[PDB]
Amino acid sequence: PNPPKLTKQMNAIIDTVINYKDSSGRQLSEVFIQLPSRKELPEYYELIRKPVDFKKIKERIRNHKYRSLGDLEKDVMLLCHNAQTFNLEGSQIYEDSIVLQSVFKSARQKIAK
Amino acid sequence: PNPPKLTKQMNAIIDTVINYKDSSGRQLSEVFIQLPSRKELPEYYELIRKPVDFKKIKERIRNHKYRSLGDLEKDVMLLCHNAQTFNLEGSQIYEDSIVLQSVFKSARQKIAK
Ligand SMILES: Nc1nnc(-c2ccccc2O)cc1N1CC[NH2+]CC1
Ligand SMILES: Nc1nnc(-c2ccccc2O)cc1N1CC[NH2+]CC1
Ligand SMILES: [Zn+2]
Ligand SMILES: [Zn+2]
């Protein structure tokens, strides 16, 4: 298992990302918590080779799959980059995923550095 | 708008480039569909003055921004030349971008000439 404070730092960072609200009170992470299934949106799985959602990221913290904050960052960047790949530039989901990459990076800097 | 057959030729050429697989079954265009964002890879935007990806190229065909196959070629060459500028010689991304320039040129010759 990971050291307790590393798991605590990962949960604090991911909770900051998931709970973040924009100035209109909207929780930007909402659509990213659970991917649509292969039955609901088969086109997503045709285009995205490594799907991931925040439910999977929290599971990977619980199961100690990430060995560092760098490992955690790689999956959060993947989730957002996948959203940017599937969606059109300027769409709400595409733009929300860019904001969440900034929220992750600043939360990591506050909580760990 | 462009004449329908010109848009058809551009989509046929770009679909050949995007769908191309090497002999190991790998779709070489994968990494080039959507650039990493400025938050994910700020160094790319510091070094590359005119970033472009295949999502942008398909948008420019849809919006009739390219007025000829020469205009289309210039952006595909830019994408690959940018990949060669950012990456080290001999890296997979650098070498894949050289192969895609050949795939574009041969697809243009088949489909249009
Ligand atoms: N368009 C979409 N793009 N991306 C996601 C998505 C969800 C979780 C993790 C990563 C993701 O990229 C969900 C999407 N939609 C939700 C609303 N219904 C249409 C489909
Ligand atoms: N190294 C990289 N170089 N180039 C691109 C790239 C992407 C789209 C269009 C043009 C490009 O040049 C992506 C790169 N990487 C992807 C994997 N993660 C590390 C960054
Ligand atoms: Zn749904
Ligand atoms: Zn990425």
Swiss-Prot record, chains A, B:
Residues that coordinate or bind Zn(2+): H64, H81
Domain of life: Eukaryota
Lineage of the species this protein comes from: Eukaryota, Metazoa, Chordata, Craniata, Vertebrata
Gene designation: SMARCA2
Subunit structure: Component of the multiprotein chromatin-remodeling complexes SWI/SNF: SWI/SNF-A (BAF), SWI/SNF-B (PBAF) and related complexes. The canonical complex contains a catalytic subunit (either SMARCA4/BRG1/BAF190A or SMARCA2/BRM/BAF190B, mutually exclusive) and at least SMARCE1, ACTL6A/BAF53, SMARCC1/BAF155, SMARCC2/BAF170, and SMARCB1/SNF5/BAF47. Other subunits specific to each of the complexes may also be present permitting several possible combinations developmentally and tissue specific.
Protein family according to the UniProt entry: Belongs to the SNF2/RAD54 helicase family.
Shown residues in whole-protein numbering: 1378 to 1508 of 1590
Compartmental location: Nucleus
PTM: During apoptosis, cleaved by cathepsin CTSG to produce a 160 kDa cleavage product which localizes to the cytosol. Ubiquitinated.
Record's disease association: Nicolaides-Baraitser syndrome: A rare disorder characterized by severe intellectual disability with absent or limited speech, seizures, short stature, sparse hair, typical facial characteristics, brachydactyly, prominent finger joints and broad distal phalanges. Some of the features are progressive with time. Blepharophimosis-impaired intellectual development syndrome: An autosomal dominant congenital syndrome characterized by blepharophimosis, facial dysmorphism, global development delay, delayed motor skills, impaired intellectual development with poor or absent speech, and behavioral abnormalities in some patients. Additional variable features include distal skeletal anomalies, feeding difficulties with poor growth, respiratory infections, and hypotonia with peripheral spasticity.
Chain's role: ATPase involved in transcriptional activation and repression of select genes by chromatin remodeling (alteration of DNA-nucleosome topology). Component of SWI/SNF chromatin remodeling complexes that carry out key enzymatic activities, changing chromatin structure by altering DNA-histone contacts within a nucleosome in an ATP-dependent manner. Binds DNA non-specifically. Belongs to the neural progenitors-specific chromatin remodeling complex (npBAF complex) and the neuron-specific chromatin remodeling complex (nBAF complex).
Annotated ranges, domain Bromo: 1-111
Protein name per Swiss-Prot or TrEMBL: SWI/SNF-related matrix-associated actin-dependent regulator of chromatin subfamily A member 2
